[PDB]
Symmetry: D3
Subunit: 250 residues, 6 copies
């Protein structure tokens, strides 16, 4: 291996410069199966890597795991191996009433409610997505047909208190995050997820291209427990968009 | 007489205009308005000068923000009160990347928040991000009229001197916080310095208003050059041509 | 021109060391008319400069505009040309019930609700006025006769949310400034304006003398809209003091 | 499932109140195998859960993945299921010259270089380990025989810049972390890892007991590349200590 | 012949007679009381709020030196004692409990402190834990068991003020700054035991400089029941805590 | 016996006094009180020593704060409870400017807040500013008795050593935040270091209490580290004379 965690060499990549980066290691094969000649490369900890082909060009699919820290490891080590473009496909909870379950969200930039982004750039630096990647994702969503919303995402280091969930062991939220969801809602923030702030900051401050897309499986203004079939169908719709966007970026 | 505190304008003066081109320099307001059909002076109070024009049969407003976030926040808020929902900023800038030349056009996706006014609308963690449709329109407009264009991050500073790490000053010193800051922004791929985008982009993105940012490069901080007057006017006119062309796509 | 913005040479000043710095460019001519032999030097952007004479000594009047950014440009470039003393005359909204419209406020130091001050000194540094300038302003106010209050001013980077105005497009104020006016009120803060924090910090941290005076045209505890007559009379009232204070400091 | 991510019900735990929480999902089976009646329960994303028996009492082993964010999910959901005591066993890079590879480190408290801890308590709150858990770990290390160091740990949201690694794609470290390792070294900080700040903060501020132990596989003052034999032995050595400590806390 | 090796304490290295441990109360009036519990106590110096006594414990010299109230004077005392050769510091203090289950007369051992002070920042950034030394904490817990006391072990909120930082409204202004409004309830929910005024500075400055520090306090008031402490119970609680800190020092010699 | 928690004073003990002189050193209290009429010791508890005296027929309190903001905040609050509305601090200081000599008198207009206690009364953005009347009285008193006086900004630190960038210590290190800080304050025109003014000035200015700050220079950091044990006594006597004369002007 050429890297500390991923278990990959430069040769394993076969000249690939683009990586699709899901959070869930189980999503990796599912994404790679959508493309030509899918091949398993490695699996260590939360990092599962597959190689495939898109229009005759080698492409990488690699899981980040949940959160900025494991994301930062995966992205850094992929960058060492030659990856220059990163496309994140994730799941999300929407916080705006007009966004429905099954909708697709493309992130222009993220609210930095994480710690890892600060290890690459000070807070004043925008967690902004690459313009070409964002364009490709928006065009891909319009290509396959989806209800799409474009805007700001709140990227949190926690699933519970940082997203103002009170259905917890303690049932309390720290002062800093008390009333925070309502504030983000008023500011037009679309949704909550857990990796985009880190990914977008670390790429935008290091000359790497990054894009972010997510499928809405829950809306916080109406529900908390989603359906275990609409979840899989929403994932498949978002996976279709991210692969189509990758086509436009090769 | 007046529906707002500072601009000295009424809702009827706008005639149903929803878009506004917002330059920093008050003398540039006439320059932009003259490029469009039927230019009319509306009001001139303090640093705020407002001209109304017509683009493709649709009314368009041109309003000076003045230098910096504070007066920009006054202008944008009061225009929004009057009915403006789309704001396109055209400015001047100093590039900090060696590959960006004088005369180049820069479209800002998002800004480094080295200002104070943005914090009055959203906490620092909120991205000073431009509207996607506005950014697209500016990029397309730059390609339409033909320009050397760079798209990326801008450092938006509350000062011209210390916040942009200028040492050619009265004191000759820069506060610890900004010492070595230019080199840091350079390494992070930040294209340039200006003084209004962080405030404009934050206050619009956090209030459901669309904002775009474009600037003409009149100086590059890495090369030994003294700003030329003839090139300064040419670059201004070039950037003005793009912001008007982009406004056509957003109405 | 020897400066980037003001459009003045060192010779244009004629050895002037004191400058009266108003916010309104339309107020420069008003202040210059109170002194002997007024001459318009330059008008560029929001910066309008007039050269006048006070007691056989040249005095500069130069507009800063609203807010710290242009104030920082104006003060720095005047310092480059040779100005060592700065006297700000402004308008203000009082937040204490005992301060009336038409009253004159002399600022000892300012609450730093601005960004530009941080570009000269860290937040812990006091936005304090020069003792001689403050003395001169207090003495000048007592000389011409005025209802004067001396104390702390809140200097904000915005007119609306930073001064907790809700009569706005959004009708919302960010969490940080929610309930802030009541807090400043309890702390004995007299008023809101938009330039003093920047001016006082940048002068006190660079060996320049600065003073701050303002006329009350609005009181936030009673009424938001001022008329026409009282507004103009308060401005003329305040201008007289700043010229009289300049006489003591030369 | 009773929880969102772990795929576990309260019944699955059989009355367990203690969990051993490694970062690596592959380590879960290894820890469980040291105890009686080891049984696999679930595996979803980076969360692999096993149940075993210690002195007749049920005990849980559950991987957190790398970093505070996924740790915060695992710890929250385990708490919901009934876990009250959390013992982390991890890997670490030592930054003190006197600490050797193969040594065992017990963390009293952590430097909070993470984001997730802030979602439970403000920065001023100490990321402190539970006294009983720390005692048990120190006693367990003394029981099986190990070279043990007790003290402060730097817990970082990144593996690279936050631990001041320059052997990276960019080769740069953000200003905030430039010279940070030398600072921690002078302050007597023993080591770097990636989960303790989150774990210790979230437990100490929610009435949960937490302990932290780690095996040194690298010392940053001498070498960077760990050997894949000492690594396995150090892990085994640390696993035996955490299991013995768990015995003392039942 | 020689008067002082340090700026404030008015002590020479010889005054210490080879002592490496110091008991550091906040109150200069408490110094004699602690010293009197050990063998052959003698007053060494008294300057400002720094009163110093030396005494003998199991044939080994021990220093008792007051810090005064707050981090600033604590930082002076600890630093100058360290210059004089002290390597182990044991703080004995008074405290106001904020948990309902902790009673007046109870003894609290601090594992680590919430840093509501300024002086700790002069030694380490806020992210650094104001954590007590493990051996010192162990010795204090064992000493509390030894002499018999109702003991609670956990986190302490260490404040730069007695009033607003501890959310007291019974004041001249009757107001508390936004930052500390509702702060007590927050600390209570986080399981914080009590308020005092020196531990954050002491623990941070020692833990970041290779010095061993321990923290123990006697509860003279519980904020969820009363505000004014009884004079008699105060003396008994102080005496109870003083006995524990000496017994802990015995285990650390 | 006592109306307050720490000072050991009743309001009756004060005899209607509204002004207090507040030295840091409890042993300086008797020295200040001896300069006025009818000096009597009232209480001595912890670092708080209180004397009462008479100035032009008006009762005045002298009460020590101890070193640092925390004990200062207790003393000031509890004196305010007893009816004190005007506070005058007399202290010792180390000058950091080359032009300020040992024996000079410094009047503080406002303080750099390098303390923690000030934050418990007002957020950092609030200026640690002295009362204008108190500052005036101190400047006039210094000119009255004759002294080399400097007026300006003071750095008020929660530590004597690292916060004032002293390296002559046990560890020999200074935390990153304060590394190079003295040079920064020097460039910013900060006169000196002391340990109570930020707390005192912030807590008074934000609670409607009048506060003044004066200090005698016993060390200049650019020329020495150790004060002279004779010039110290002379300088203290000098400053004490000024604070009593200022107190005369404020009754
Ligand atoms: O509300 C959310 N917040 C969020 O950060 N994500 C992203 O995925 C993080 C790991 O589940 C996904 C959702 S949607 C959801 C709601 C309940 C259970 C699982 C997912
Ligand atoms: O370096 C710059 N920084 C910057 O913030 N701007 C934007 O215009 C602000 C007011 O001139 C423009 C420039 S380019 C320049 C260089 C020298 C003199 C005037 C403009
Ligand atoms: O409330 C105020 N806040 C404030 O920052 N200022 C200073 O002048 C800013 C430009 O009008 C002046 C006032 S008074 C006022 C009230 C309504 C309209 C214009 C001024
Ligand atoms: O230096 C370190 N920093 C650190 O945070 N850890 C903890 O485990 C993080 C995931 O590998 C482990 C180590 S030791 C090391 C050194 C080289 C490659 C892999 C681990
Ligand atoms: O609530 C407290 N807060 C606190 O910081 N301490 C510690 O000693 C500080 C100086 O008395 C002690 C107490 S208990 C108390 C209550 C009322 C009057 C005196 C002490
Ligand atoms: O440099 C100083 N910094 C400072 O904060 N003070 C104020 O008095 C604090 C307790 O001595 C006094 C001085 S002068 C000095 C220098 C060496 C030993 C004692 C006093
Ligand atoms: K302006
Ligand atoms: K993870
Ligand atoms: K003290």
């Amino acid at each position: 291996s050429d890297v500390f965690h991923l278990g990959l060499t430069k040769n394993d990549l076969q000249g690939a410069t683009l990586a699709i980066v899901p959070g869930d290691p189980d999503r990796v094969e599912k994404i790679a199966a959508l493309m030509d000649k899918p091949v398993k490369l490695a699996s260590h900890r939360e990092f599962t890597t597959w190689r495939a082909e898109l229009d005759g060009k080698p492409v990488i699919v690699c899981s980040t795991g949940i959160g900025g820290p494991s994301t930062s490891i995966a992205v850094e080590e992929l960058a060492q191996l030659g990856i220059r473009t990163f496309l994140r496909i994730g799941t999300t909870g929407a916080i705006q009433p007009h966004i429905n379950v099954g909708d697709v969200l493309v992130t222009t930039a993220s609210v930095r409610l994480d710690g890892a982004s600060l290890h690459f750039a000070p807070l004043e630096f925008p967690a902004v997505a690459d313009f070409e990647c964002t364009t490709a994702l928006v065009e891909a969503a319009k290509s396959i047909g989806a209800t799409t919303h474009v805007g700001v995402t709140a990227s949190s280091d926690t699933f519970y208190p940082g997203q103002e969930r009170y259905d917890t062991y303690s049932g309390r939220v720290v002062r800093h995050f008390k009333g925070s969801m309502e504030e983000w809602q008023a500011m037009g923030v679309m949704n909550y997820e857990m990796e985009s702030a880190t990914l977008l900051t670390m790429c935008a401050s290091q000359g790497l291209r990054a894009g972010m897309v997510a499928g809405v499986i829950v809306n916080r203004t109406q529900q908390e427990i989603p359906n275990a079939e609409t979840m899989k169908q929403t994932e498949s719709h978002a996976v279709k968009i991210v692969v189509e966007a990758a086509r436009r970026l090769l």
